[PDB]
Symmetry: D2
Subunit: 326 residues, 4 copies
């Protein structure tokens, strides 16, 4: 044949195979936005996709294969989980009148099928849980997977902190990366915007505006936080989905892991014994991320009323968790 006339294999032993392999579970818009952001940034040597909707999957994966010229990653995708084998990272994005309990249980049924097959072909992978709710669901994945605490991570408040920095940048006319601000705790309505850490170039903003975040504030910084959390709702109440920002925040998280940067990200993780948290639950706090997974946590010096909010959420979170069939 032509291939033979043209090429002679000069390697005796079997190829070592991919080494930065990432798998994205789920091909809804959140998976594809995660996948295309990962590919566009050259973060891994192989990207695998997986979902129960076989046709939808094959169309996504065929489409991305067709751009292989502008990329640097091998792309695979299949319904069988042997396609995900030997991943370093597995980003889980599969998802959901009705009760929160019960909406949670369904999402947990979904995880019951997925996790075992992931563990089966990627025993040493790091799980990065992305589907909502993320705090409880990272927990589910963690006990429902057997992995050591450090290999099970929830995306937590990463995007919201990003979104919070973006909104603060627009108010100030500064690029987002020059505005520093952190949102922690339970992702969504009950998250904690830590006003004492909001600074530009180490200059405390609350320092310049002591009422920042309170009812005495003449500039309604609290509404910015509310805007961050109403984020997904406003976008979906507009184009009927959310994806882009999340996908970019996923690739950001993944780059920190695969390049072993020891970078600090607000992500969801086991917080028992932090800030008075009694129960075994997951919440976002600043965490160190590398290729070992989540290696370290940062202890922010939180005021009493902020530790309190974190304790109340853990109770609400643990309320639901005790009701779960795992």
């Amino acid at each position: 044949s032509t291939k033979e006339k043209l090429i002679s294999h000069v390697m005796k032993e079997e190829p070592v195979g991919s080494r930065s392999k990432v798998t994205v579970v789920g091909v809804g818009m959140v998976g594809m936005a995660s996948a295309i952001s990962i590919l566009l940034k050259d973060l891994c040597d192989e990207l695998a996709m997986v979902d129960v909707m076989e046709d939808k999957l094959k169309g996504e994966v065929m489409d991305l294969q067709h751009g292989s010229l502008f990329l640097k990653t091998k792309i695979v995708g299949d319904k069988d989980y042997s396609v995900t084998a030997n991943s370093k990272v597995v980003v889980v994005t599969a998802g959901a009148g009705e009760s929160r309990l019960n909406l949670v249980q369904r999402n947990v049924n979904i995880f019951k099928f997925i996790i075992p097959n992931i563990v089966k072909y990627s025993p040493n992978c790091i799980l990065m849980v992305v589907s909502n709710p993320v705090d409880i669901l990272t927990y589910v994945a963690w006990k429902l997977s057997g992995f050591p605490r450090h290999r099970v991570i929830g995306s937590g408040t990463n995007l919201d902190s990003a979104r919070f920095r973006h909104l603060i940048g627009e108010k100030l006319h500064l690029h987002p990366s020059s505005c520093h601000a952190w949102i922690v705790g339970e992702h969504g309505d009950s998250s904690v915007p830590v006003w004492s850490g909001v600074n530009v170039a180490g200059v405390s903003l609350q320092g310049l505006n002591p009422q920042m975040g309170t009812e005495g504030d003449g500039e309604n910084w609290k509404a910015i936080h509310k805007e961050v959390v109403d984020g997904a709702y406003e976008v979906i109440k507009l184009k009927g989905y959310t994806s882009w920002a999340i996908g970019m925040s996923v690739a950001d998280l993944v780059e920190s892991i695969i390049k072993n940067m020891h970078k600090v990200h607000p992500v969801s993780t086991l917080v028992q014994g932090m800030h008075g948290v009694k129960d075994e639950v997951f919440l976002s706090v600043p965490c160190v991320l590398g290729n070992s997974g989540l290696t370290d946590v940062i202890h922010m010096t939180l005021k009493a009323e902020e530790e309190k909010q974190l304790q109340k959420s853990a109770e609400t979170l643990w309320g639901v968790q005790k009701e779960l069939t795992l």
Copy 2:
């Protein structure tokens, strides 16, 4: 306020404003895939979006604004075309039992509204036409815009040539960029896969397989070409749309223009007087692209039966064009 306590403006004169501004017309999946690929690669200092579907637009643009932390481009989007002002590139992606004539006329009605508003706020912009059919539609945009030939470009056979190189890479187990092959002419069913230029490292493949592309071929290289053109149909017959590969091929085209690389891309452009083409029509041939737009065309040495295919398409293309209300 806090901003004032913190920041003092030390520039007397008005800001010079964005200088690499790109606008993507249309927020279907092709526009967003073009937009997110452009943003992920840091290609411009401002990306603007525009579409008649105001709500859908605002949701897309709000979503991408929310990732501004991981990006380096200012993002705008509005229904009014003053938002597109001062673009360097305008990528047009808006689109369509029924006759091809009439499906074309509708797409041309769409262009009649769009083009004038684009020309109005970006008199010196380069148009890159992407919606199908692309050959006739780049033509429409060109006379319907008044721009000099070089500022009006059709994406032509860029992605298909890419897809062709990808498929050839999978057969050979080589990265796509090491397999060189060109598809020219009218985009779609009647395109020309130039077998004499198919090489790896300057080694002619047809040289090793003289029957390449013909009925005497023992390896059916012709079917690879057919696969490239059945591409969009197979993907859509699977996930119900196409986007990813096109978006990446758009950003590739845009990078070559904005960085002024004088790079060679197979794109659609005026071919009258090339290869015996009599009529005023657009087809893909290798073209030089820079920040001036499309500066040069390459004359491939085509065999007679390949010049013939290009002439027949131009007649079919000019058949439809003469019927158009412009």
Copy 3:
């Protein structure tokens, strides 16, 4: 000829020419490290070099031209300053028993030849002064150039702040970008490490260690600062030059300008009227950078003894300046 047989020019009007053009004045190791970092990161569409040592220049520029395949920038270099024409940014790196006064005057003689030729071919360029001393020398360039305050920038404490964040990252085992800390004022021995702004994820370090930076400190954070400033001396006392870190910090500064990011960098600029500074001198404070140049300055809330250090430096700086022949 072959070119003609192969290519036909299809553009009637003159090319628009380069639009992100950067010029690096000086081909010592600092210029080349600036140039290669700028090129490796795709920041501009044309990089020009210039230096009085014609042969050395031509060898540097020929060498970088030879890698044009892995790059995306046009590369020029000449002794005549018409080669620098139409730059957006001009990074000035040309440089020097003896008195500081007199070492300064020589560097100022050097600037007297260079600046006028730069202004001549790039009337609207932004100057980024890099050679030491940088605070006085940015000043020299500014009055000796006629440009509005915002188009004249000194690299100030950018690298030192970077180096400070790197050293803090090694002590903490965190990536540099997760450790935030600022050094301001007069670059070198008398710079100010602002301990109140040193934080990881908004968590004040001085908050955890109240003695940070003082003689009561049980961890000698002051020595870290001293290490940052002894930086260039220790490296040169080892390999006989410094370049790499500076070059990377230059490209960082340049990217913020050319992509119009409105990002915050500690750079040297006019500080009269800031923090009790009476005299017309330049020092590093957090500054907003975009494609307009230096648009905004940040007012850090400095303690009295830190405003005092800045005032004393300005007097020492203005001591020398009043002695200069400009």
Copy 4:
């Protein structure tokens, strides 16, 4: 301490350690240009340096450590080779009236110390030999290392082919990546510019100019080749060294290996049994590169007088080799 108050380690087991580790042997300008290009492009998670000149080394490595903020790689450097442990790639750059025989033997003495220590801490590393002469020296490293053919690669004609494409781009006013041309065989004076493969967009140039490369050529294409090989000499006869282009060509080679791209590069490798080559020697031919190393070779269809040149070089190369003390 502060670190403790701030950070709690939540990982029980030992970190997995770096996974894309590259080591550059040698801190002359070729090593640093290789190192800074590798770092600027985010290609590995750890870059190690090594050289017998301890002080020079420590100054280079300290300098690059100081830019860790703008980078994503951990940087190490030491005289002891345990610092190079667990590298995926080891780029060897250490180097040399007098005879070629004897200049070769000295370079081979140098390799005798280096190779064993490399093999000792990186038993499964891929060697990429860069120092001149490269063809014989890759050979030396190969038998003098014990590695399987595929883990021992010479940089061969990579840069020269790049330089050849750059020069062809300047003549044609096309970006280098759109001009395709290959130089093979023994690197330097006796290399083979394969005129039949010189094309733009699959269009044979020799096709348009049948005399290309010969004494009947009206455009002296042969002189372009001579210019490529006189490259290093002309640059050094100007600035007193060469580095930049080589460093960029090294990072290009390294990216293809670490991302497992299966990309085609003209590199030096065992050619016995190719094109009539009898002897055990190394020359450049198009080779497939991935994370397994050099997996495949391409058989170019060379005319008889081009196979002859390759055979004559192998004899000249094997002339010297038989004289070596290994």
